[PDB]
Design a binder for this molecule. Structure first.
Ligand SMILES: *[C@@H]1O[C@H](CO)[C@@H](O[C@@H]2O[C@H](CO)[C@@H](O)[C@H](O)[C@H]2NC(C)=O)[C@H](O)[C@H]1NC(C)=O
Ligand SMILES: *[C@@H]1O[C@H](CO)[C@@H](O[C@@H]2O[C@H](CO)[C@@H](O)[C@H](O)[C@H]2NC(C)=O)[C@H](O)[C@H]1NC(C)=O
Ligand SMILES: *[C@@H]1O[C@H](CO)[C@@H](O[C@@H]2O[C@H](CO)[C@@H](O)[C@H](O)[C@H]2NC(C)=O)[C@H](O)[C@H]1NC(C)=O
Ligand SMILES: *[C@@H]1O[C@H](CO)[C@@H](O)[C@H](O)[C@H]1NC(C)=O
Ligand SMILES: *[C@@H]1O[C@H](CO)[C@@H](O)[C@H](O)[C@H]1NC(C)=O
Lengths: 153, 109, 119, 245
């Protein structure tokens, strides 16, 4: 039911607004400006198409994890699909996230908002911390530990 | 084709003054395709004003004029002794090329 | 240059054919389109017929559709022009000049009296 | 192609197109630019490539240059002196001939135009102070004019097609670069290598280590790159320092 996320810095067609939408057959990404849309809809949102400067087209229950990062105009999305379910309603366990795509968009990004199919998701944050990682023999991350949490750490 | 008609047939105008001459056509020919020659008696014509604004070599910057559309105007500054010549309008837009009706410029004593 | 010297003319018969050869030299003839104009005694100038040296193309007004022929030769640089079955009304004086080519149109021919006779 | 008074504008991004094939051809009569030589066109990388296309009369091809005047250079198109691009103009005598008169251009305008301005309008410009509207009259002039591109015209009157390319010097993250050269590979030799930016020296050998489908090169310790996969084959290799003693 979760479909996509609409980003921006003013939520108006005046300034660049990135947009990602799942089509159930091909994900679509574009940077063309769109006017404000408080209540997105869908059925098988669009109000302005000024300055279309990019386009891209590509491809226990499921708990998909994403991490969105932005450095000097580069947009990185790290994704993971199948986690380990120790208990329901609480995502315990360890997982590793792989890099999906790099976007040289340069959009400036201050805020965003998600999209649902009208007819449960957790949000986190990041800080510049220091970590220690133990690499497996094959190349995967198997364990990590903090460096500013506990005296033992 | 479009025939070129000159409103005045002949100018028996005295020396010193400043008048104008007109080339008239049934329709607009071009902004800059037309031109004017000068057929001296018993000689060959020579072009001075081309592109309807520009001037060829040898013009003392005395002969001028402006216009567009179905009618064009060519102006002078002050008549002198060498102005007793002939003038011919031209057009090159359409495939049949025609000439102006001609004006027998002359001075009066 | 020598200013587009033309073949000499003369009196002819109403039913013959005179040839005008505007041979010349002094500038390139592979890209300069020639033209033929005529003037009857004290009458408006009238463009007779032009030829295109770029592809040696012939086109000319419809006042005389099928009685004008032009041949170009860049080898010896000659411009051959004739009319079929000339009448006594065709007496005039002819120029070969430069039309269609570079913007600075100039170099009108020296002229040649192409007149008819009945005596 | 569009007329000059409404010049066709297009944007090209996210591609790698060789520029050598352009000036290596013979159809392009005029290939003029100063901001960059043809040799280093493919060497450099650019951003925001814009193409402007139109059809004009031959005799005024000179008027398309940085800092020039004229009817076309003032009322139909503007070229700033600080221009970073190139101009390609070539004859289209056999493609636009009969003559044909479907072309138009701006003749009268209030003043000059800002750089890269698109001058579109339709008004009865008046050569006096009396206000005339609706129909043309005395000292009321039609802003446009046509072209007599007769097939049997000479030089300067045949229609010419003009394309102007502009760009910026990577003011944003790189979008369009030039083609990158490639060569073969050798084994069991002391060679210096430049694998897509990663440069070094050593001897190349075949490897049995397994990479994940998304890394590019591995290492062991102390910033000592040891294993690299070739982008062409996606085959993992081994680096070994050349012998000395
Ligand atoms: C995000 O927006 C801020 C403004 O709120 C940008 O800061 C300036 O932006 C202007 C034009 O956008 C630039 O010319 C300045 O150089 C910027 N100042 C600084 C100190 O960078 C900021 O650059 C924007 N970020 C991005 C990635 O576009
Ligand atoms: C590291 O990867 C190798 C290659 O995939 C693994 O070796 C095989 O792994 C499969 C399961 O993916 C087993 O069915 C085979 O029996 C393994 N063969 C051998 C010879 O080991 C290896 O197990 C991986 N090591 C890890 C994940 O720690
Ligand atoms: C670069 O791509 C081309 C296009 O596929 C490769 O050419 C062939 O690719 C098929 C893919 O199944 C192989 O079966 C053929 O053996 C390839 N032919 C050749 C002559 O290589 C090409 O191999 C790719 N480059 C490399 C280094 O593998
Ligand atoms: C989804 O796919 C269909 C079929 O290709 C297409 O018509 C439609 O535009 C797509 N949706 C979006 C939002 O692009
Ligand atoms: C591009 O953005 C500018 C900003 O004002 C706007 O004026 C223009 O119409 C836009 N062009 C397109 C094609 O969206």
């Amino acid at each position: 039911i979760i479909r996509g996320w609409i980003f921006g810095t003013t939520l108006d067609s005046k300034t660049q607004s990135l947009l990602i939408v799942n089509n159930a057959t091909n994900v679509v990404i574009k940077v063309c400006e769109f006017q404000f849309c408080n209540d997105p809809f869908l059925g098988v949102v669009y109000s302005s198409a000024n300055n279309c400067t990019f386009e891209y087209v590509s491809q226990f229950k499921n708990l998909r994890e994403f991490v969105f990062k932005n450095i000097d105009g580069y947009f990185k999305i790290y994704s993971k699909h199948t986690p380990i379910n120790l208990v329901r309603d609480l995502p315990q366990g360890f997982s590793a996230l792989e890099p999906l795509v790099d976007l040289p968009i340069g959009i400036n990004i201050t805020r965003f908002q998600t999209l649902l199919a009208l007819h449960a998701y957790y949000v986190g944050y990041l800080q510049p911390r220091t970590f220690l990682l133990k690499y497996n023999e094959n190349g995967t991350i198997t364990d990590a530990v903090d460096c500013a949490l506990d005296p033992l750490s | 084709q479009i025939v070129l008609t000159q409103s005045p047939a002949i100018m028996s105008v005295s020396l010193g003054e400043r008048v104008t001459m007109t080339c008239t056509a049934s329709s607009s020919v071009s902004s800059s395709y037309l031109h004017w020659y000068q057929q001296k008696p018993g000689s060959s014509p020579k072009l001075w004003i081309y592109s309807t604004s520009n001037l060829a070599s040898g013009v003392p910057a005395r002969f001028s004029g402006s216009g567009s559309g179905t009618s064009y105007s060519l102006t002078i500054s002050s008549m002198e002794a060498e102005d007793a010549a002939t003038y011919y309008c031209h057009q090159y837009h359409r495939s049949p090329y025609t000439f102006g009706g001609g004006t027998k410029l002359e001075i009066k004593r | 240059e020598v200013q587009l010297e033309e073949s000499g003319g003369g009196l002819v018969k109403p039913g013959g054919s005179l040839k005008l050869s505007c041979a010349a030299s002094g500038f390139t003839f592979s890209s300069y389109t020639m033209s033929w104009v005529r003037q009857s005694p004290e009458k408006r100038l009238e463009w007779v017929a032009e030829i295109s040296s770029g592809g040696t193309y012939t086109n000319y007004p419809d006042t005389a559709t099928g009685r004008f022929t032009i041949s170009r030769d860049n080898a010896k640089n000659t411009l051959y022009l004739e009319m079929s079955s000339l009448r006594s009304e065709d007496t005039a004086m002819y120029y070969c000049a430069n039309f269609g080519n570079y913007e600075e149109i100039a170099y009108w021919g020296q002229g040649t009296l192409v007149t008819v006779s009945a005596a | 192609f569009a007329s000059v008074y409404a010049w066709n504008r297009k944007r090209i991004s996210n591609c790698v197109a060789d520029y050598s094939v352009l000036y290596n051809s013979a159809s392009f009569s005029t290939f003029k630019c100063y901001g960059v030589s043809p040799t280093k066109l493919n060497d450099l990388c650019f951003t925001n490539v814009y193409a402007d296309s139109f059809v004009i009369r031959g005799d005024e091809v000179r008027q398309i240059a940085p800092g020039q005047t004229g009817k076309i250079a003032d009322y139909n198109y503007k070229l700033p002196d600080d221009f970073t691009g190139c101009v390609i103009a070539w004859n289209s005598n056999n493609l636009d001939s009969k003559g044909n008169y479907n072309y138009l251009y701006r003749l009268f305008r209030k003043s000059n135009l800002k750089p890269f301005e698109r001058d579109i309008s339709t008004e009865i410009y008046q050569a006096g102070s009396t206000p005339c509207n609706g129909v043309e009259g005395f000292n009321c002039y039609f802003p446009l004019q046509s072209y007599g591109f007769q097939p049997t015209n000479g030089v300067g009157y045949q229609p010419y097609r003009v394309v102007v390319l502009s760009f910026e010097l990577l003011h944003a993250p790189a979008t369009v670069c030039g083609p990158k050269k490639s060569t073969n590979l050798v084994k069991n030799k002391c060679v210096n290598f430049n694998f897509n930016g990663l440069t070094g020296t050593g001897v190349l050998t075949e490897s049995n280590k397994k990479f994940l489908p998304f890394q590019q090169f591995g290492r062991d310790i102390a910033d000592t790159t040891d294993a690299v996969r070739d982008p062409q084959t996606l085959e993992i290799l081994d680096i070994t320092p050349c012998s000395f003693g």
